[PDB]
Design a protein around this nucleic acid. Structure first.
Ligand SMILES: Nc1ncnc2c1ncn2[C@@H]1O[C@H](COP(=O)(O)O[C@@H]2[C@H](O)[C@@H](COP(=O)(O)OP(=O)(O)OP(=O)(O)O)O[C@H]2n2cnc3c(=O)[nH]cnc32)[C@@H](O)[C@H]1O
Ligand SMILES: Nc1ncnc2c1ncn2[C@@H]1O[C@H](COP(=O)(O)OP(=O)(O)OP(=O)(O)O)[C@@H](O)[C@H]1O
Ligand SMILES: [Mg+2]
Ligand SMILES: [Mg+2]
Ligand SMILES: [Zn+2]
Ligand SMILES: [Zn+2]
Lengths: 343, 346
DNA sequence: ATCTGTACATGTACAGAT
DNA sequence: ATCTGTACATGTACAGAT
DNA sequence: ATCTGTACATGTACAGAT
DNA sequence: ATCTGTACATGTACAGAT
């Protein structure tokens, strides 16, 4: 039933092989260009993020997310009002992006990438028209197949995480206090998503990657000498429900995969035991996930998992209309055996 | 009953405070000295090991173990006659300890020892001498007196960052317990060679750093023994077993061949055999301790206790310990077991 | 003026003390 | 149930060296 | 400072056993 | 239908060499 759906959603090794071989060619070349040429981004380092690298990518290997992270000296943050997620950066190579302007820096980053792509004749690859606000430089590759790659500029700070995250990452009952303390000793990242043009947003893609690949209360969850859980499978099913709904109804344009990822982090925290995510109980697990996501919509509350004061479902970010709309559509699919899965 | 014993065994904060304040003074000074002038041990780094740093030290804070580890690039090992544990190592600073390519353990240890003795002489803050050398030991042992007697084993160590030696490939069977990711990461840590004998150029592998990790990350659940997790009795069983041996050892010299490492090894095997945190419930301390004794007794009777990291190395081989010694310890354990542990009452 | 090995600053888990 | 000392990991400041 | 080699985890694909 | 074993593929951390 849902096994049958996950089978459809499963990526093929051949497709993975071909898609990766190309994406890596391009990314390696873009990365080479940032240092081996005397740009402001010399020393920038690669960090693969998102669904493909978490092993929760569904349908096809056609969307890849990569951080080009840049370690910066002693940095001063100032929270953009009380948003929790957005900051101004303050205090050498970067002088010419001065307060460090996100858009000015992103523009140069973008300009370089556009130049390097022009010089690529191996592969059919253009640079997508800029979406204002967005921190990505998006590449549209065509093998025969359409593949998109988000190159995300990132500042890496080695200081302790900003105050807004102090109560974030409530993994203590699930992954534990040692894991949490160690995770919060990793750097934090700022990406140039706006709000305006000088605002950066916190990024925990590196932390989310760790969590995805170390998601059990037991150290052996999903390992060769351990028991398989269905945590990732539920994430996939939920992602697919949204993807399918999103491509049918334009009313759902305000919703994205990060909403679902956030909700399931909360579910995993609420239901820490690996036994509460037994493969045999895939149906009820998926169901309790839907129920939870519906409560978030109804209460208009979905807190950033790392930044509790940042509500992704705040009125200011998404209309009541949009939420009620998605509620009805989810409720419908739920109470009619998920017809949309059959497409 | 056993809670009451563990209460006695528990260290006091006051004693910990005083003992540590002194030990650290001495060790910091000894370590500072190694970095001086054209010392062959410049770059040597500190790594605290053993029971005190694993939180399984019992009775008093009176024995501390410290590795002074020294990174040695481009190093070639040759296993000493298929033993698994022992190896030969082959204007550089260590040049002075070589015998045509071969790094002498004893020559190196001797210099190490000489330096330490010299540095201790110059300490008048604290009452601290250097214990007479124990044959078949890699340690330089300090006897500090505070008022109270405290000993500190300074252990010379080579640090190699290469892959662990072949003999350990089947070692550390933690896959069903701590997992494959933990194991892979652990085996990416360096391995250590200490100058224990067999001859004067032989070194022995050391996994004290790994054992420390295991002790402090001993559960199948990541929250085992944490503030938002469930307490197990794994460490408590180790303490009780250590105490049984310590008490027996200081009464009967027949038990001189036995050490705390034997019990530590046995319990690593027990933890592997019983991976679930529920199999080590605090409420079931008695049966947990009992199954541990039963296991240790089987090891003695079958004369088999494999090094947890080096499976082919049997710590209870006839060549290391007499049948007599094992049977003796068997009877004494069996006795304590079947008479309510009278020796705990001392 | 810049660079650096060393010491310190900051944070938390663990366990003992209250 | 809360509070506190020690160990340990990671970041950063800086007197002495260059 | 950069690059390659090695080991193994997380996947997929599929046959034979249950 | 599911489970187990093997083969094949990609990702990633880190050591040793340059
Ligand atoms: N903080 C960030 N760290 C890393 N990458 C980021 C971050 N913020 C944004 N990005 C990347 O920028 C591109 C566009 O982002 P938008 O902010 O315009 O909207 C995001 C996007 O449309 C959607 C899905 O993101 P992603 O492709 O990473 O999803 P996935 O988890 O890989 O799954 P699938 O590819 O299978 O769907 O989510 C939106 N979004 C909103 N907030 C966030 C956030 O904090 N992190 C990530 N996405 C977010 C994208 O490439 C995005 O990754
Ligand atoms: N025979 C041995 N083989 C391998 N490692 C050993 C051996 N003996 C001791 N060690 C290592 O040296 C460490 C310190 O030795 P020591 O005898 O002090 O034991 P311990 O675990 O500290 O317990 P305690 O000191 O309370 O008896 C041990 O924890 C272990 O890692
Ligand atoms: Mg993605
Ligand atoms: Mg000790
Ligand atoms: Zn799992
Ligand atoms: Zn425990």
């Amino acid at each position: 039933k849902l096994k049958k759906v996950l089978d459809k959603l499963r990526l093929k090794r051949k497709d993975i092989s071909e898609a990766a071989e190309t994406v890596n060619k391009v990314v390696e070349r873009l990365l080479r260009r940032m240092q081996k040429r005397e740009s402001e981004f010399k020393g920038v380092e690669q960090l693969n993020t998102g669904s493909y690298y978490e092993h929760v990518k569904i349908s096809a290997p056609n969307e890849f997310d990569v951080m080009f992270k840049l370690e910066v000296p002693r940095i001063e943050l100032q929270e953009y009002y009380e948003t929790g997620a957005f900051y101004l950066v303050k205090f050498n190579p970067l002088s010419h992006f001065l307060v460090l302007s996100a858009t000015k820096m992103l523009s140069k980053f973008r300009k370089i990438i556009k130049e390097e792509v022009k010089e690529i004749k191996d592969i059919d690859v253009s640079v997508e028209k800029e979406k204002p606000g967005s921190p990505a430089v998006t590449l549209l590759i065509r093998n025969p197949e359409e593949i998109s790659v988000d190159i995300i500029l990132a500042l890496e700070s080695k200081g302790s995480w900003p105050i807004s995250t102090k109560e974030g990452l409530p993994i203590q009952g699930w992954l534990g206090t040692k894991v949490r303390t160690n995770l919060r000793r990793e750097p934090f990242y700022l990406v140039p998503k706006n709000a305006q043009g000088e605002t950066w947003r916190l990024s925990f893609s590196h932390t989310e990657k760790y969590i995805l690949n170390n998601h059990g209360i037991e150290k052996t969850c999903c390992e060769s000498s351990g028991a398989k859980c269905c945590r990732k499978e539920c994430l996939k099913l939920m992602k697919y429900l949204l993807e399918q709904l999103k491509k049918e109804f334009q009313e759902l344009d305000a919703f994205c995969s990060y909403h679902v990822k956030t909700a399931i982090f909360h579910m995993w925290t609420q239901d820490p035991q690996d036994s509460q995510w037994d493969p045999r109980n895939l149906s009820s697990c998926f169901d309790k996930l839907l129920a939870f996501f519906l409560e978030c919509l109804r209460t208009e509350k979905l807190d950033h998992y790392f930044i509790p004061k940042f509500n992704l479902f705040s009125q200011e970010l998404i209309d009541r209309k949009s939420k009620e709309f998605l509620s009805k559509k989810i409720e419908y699919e739920r109470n009619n055996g998920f017809p949309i899965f059959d497409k």
